[PDB]
């Protein structure tokens, strides 16, 4: 079974620049390529097929090219409606295989995240558990590392976060925190710290809270 790999995985670029994405096959098909554009929550749409010819309803800004194994797709010049994931396909042998996908975002400038930490309330203790939340907002880029320091130690498992997709005018992201711990193990320690290492500052800011505060 032929496999394909695309590079890069996530390409961030502003409006008006040329973008070249690649697709590589393990075997030489020569005849078969299909590039797709899938918007968020939408069905895929065909752009260029047979590695060269563009499909119907596709603007002339998309020019694909290639031969043998290695293939490419060039976008000039990028517009505001072209953001989305891209895929590549082979027609040559069953099964038909697809690439891993390439996310195309809009490039922005540096932005500092909004740090938020709040202690848990007294209502959830009735159900036999407690959850503390840590939120960050308006941060770019999406590269981040979460760190929870409890008595100078890390706890696993049970530490995971979620994010929001790119906005339109703001075009930033957001975070969330969900931690699963019962009620009697919340009072065994005191110092709780939410740390996030980002490239804005060399030293991550520190914010902590206590029990009776």
């Amino acid at each position: 079974d032929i496999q394909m790999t695309q590079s890069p995985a996530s390409l961030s670029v502003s409006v008006g620049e040329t973008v070249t994405i690649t697709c590589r096959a393990s075997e030489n098909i020569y005849s078969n390529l299909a590039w797709y554009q899938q918007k968020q929550g939408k069905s895929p749409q065909l752009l260029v097929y047979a590695a060269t010819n563009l499909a119907d309803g596709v603007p002339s800004r998309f020019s694909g090219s290639g031969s043998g194994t290695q293939y490419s797709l060039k976008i000039n010049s990028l517009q505001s409606e072209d953001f989305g994931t891209y895929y590549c396909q082979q027609f040559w042998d069953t099964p038909f295989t697809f690439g891993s996908g390439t996310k195309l975002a809009i490039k922005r400038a540096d932005a500092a995240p909004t740090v938020s930490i709040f202690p848990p309330s007294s209502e959830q203790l009735t159900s036999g558990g407690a959850s503390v939340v840590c939120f960050l907002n308006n941060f770019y880029p999406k590269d981040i590392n979460v760190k929870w320091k409890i008595d100078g130690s890390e706890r696993q498992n049970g530490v995971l976060n979620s994010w929001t997709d790119q906005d339109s005018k703001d075009s930033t992201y957001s975070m969330s925190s969900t931690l699963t711990l019962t009620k009697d193990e919340y009072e065994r320690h005191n110092s709780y710290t939410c740390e996030a290492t980002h490239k804005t500052s060399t030293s991550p800011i520190v914010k902590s809270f206590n029990r009776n505060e």
């Binding site: 078969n32 299909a34 069905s43 895929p44 749409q45 065909l46 097929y49 499909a55 119907d56 396909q89 027609f91 069953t94 038909f96």
Partner: peptide, 8 residues
Amino acid sequence: YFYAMDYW
């Protein structure tokens, strides 16, 4: 079966 799908 070839000629990748147009309409989805």
